[PDB]
Amino acid sequence: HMVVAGIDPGITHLGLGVVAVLKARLLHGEVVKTSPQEPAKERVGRIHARVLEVLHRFRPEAVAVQEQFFYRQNELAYKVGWALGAVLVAAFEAGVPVYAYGPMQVKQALAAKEEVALMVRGILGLKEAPRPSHLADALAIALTHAFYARMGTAKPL
Amino acid sequence: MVVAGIDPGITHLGLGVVAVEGALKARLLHGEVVKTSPQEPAKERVGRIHARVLEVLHRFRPEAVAVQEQFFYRQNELAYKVGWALGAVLVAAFEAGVPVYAYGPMQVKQALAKEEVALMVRGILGLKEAPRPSHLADALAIALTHAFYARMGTAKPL
DNA sequence: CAATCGGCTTTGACCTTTGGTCAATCGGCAG
DNA sequence: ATCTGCCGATTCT
DNA sequence: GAAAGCCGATT
């Protein structure tokens, strides 16, 4: 009945998952891998294109992204900001509202990192925990949103 | 030689374009500042940013885009939202097939010389007065800094 | 080529027989 | 409507 | 008083 996209942002790996809804089915999962040897604009451009393509194909009602709290080197925050920007243009273009959730919100909603993954595997009925780590986390975010959405406490912006 | 300069921000984004003759001298082709607000949905702020930039790139067809680098960021969250802004730009820069270059403040100040730098920008472009507001002025300086490095063959991509 | 891995987490100016302090940075809300 | 100006600066263990 | 991640190196 309900379709939710989850995202774990980063410039090198970006986790991208989609679920249909507490029990849900895995509709899609991928990780976008871009290189430092790649021109900045090519890196982010590919990101935007893949996300846009995905949003178009599956038409989710919501996108959920991982919030983050500390950032040892300000520069790192910036490049992650770049990644969320591509997403946002994509989210904007698709007319899909965007929501963001912190790690404790995820952990509490669903559960240790190893402990959370076990619950994601279970809700989606998979033989094994999803890989790699960035995809798994993206899916957790999607599922966290669904949970809050189910109780009417969405968290936009 | 056509060069775009950009001063990134989520609230105010400076956007300027110059055409270089060196004997370094250039003409102002375009200048604007994109204003968005926190009362606006995140996706609408950034989306408008991407659209304006993409429209501008399309109209003026520059050979390069230059953006301001930054060094400190007291609150990591600030860096993030600026990251958002650069992302919209990059999609735009990607879509237009325009290479992107980034420069730090000292590179700008040395190449051209805050009040002292502005005076030099005013001069090179032959304007009656220094450009306003501050975010547009800065964007233009970045464009002009790139041209300078480009002229000596020391481009600085992203 | 996948995946895995371990390190590094801001900076420069000018000053202070020496490594010190120092400021820089921008977004939300108020006139 | 527009510039102009100030203040904060990472949680949860 | 720690939380993540990206890079550039491996294998």
Author numbering:
A (entry chain B): 0 to 20, 26 to 115, 121 to 166
B (entry chain A): 1 to 21, 24 to 115, 122 to 166
What did the published study say regarding this structure?
RuvC resolvase from Gram-negative bacteria belongs to the retroviral integrase superfamily with a characteristic RNase H fold. RuvC is a dimeric endonuclease that requires divalent metal ions for activity. RuvC resolves HJs by symmetrically cleaving two of its DNA strands. Substrate binding does not depend on the DNA sequence, but the cleavage is specific and occurs preferentially at the (A/T)TT↓(G/C) cognate sequence.
Here, we present the crystal structure of T. thermophilus RuvC in complex with a short synthetic HJ solved at 3.75 Å resolution. To inhibit HJ cleavage during crystallization, we also prepared an inactive Tt-RuvC variant with E70Q substitution at the active site. The junction in complex with RuvC has the same non-crystallographic 2-fold symmetry as the protein dimer. The structure of the DNA can be described as tetrahedral. The arms are unstacked, and the two opposite arms located in the vicinity of the active sites are pointing downward from the plane between the HJ exchange point and the protein. RuvC approaches the scissile phosphates from the minor groove side of the double helix. The protein covers 4 bp on arms 1 and 2 and 8 bp on arms 3 and 4, which is consistent with footprinting data. However, in our complex structure, the loops from both dimer subunits adopt a similar conformation, suggesting that a different mechanism is responsible for sequential cleavages by RuvC.
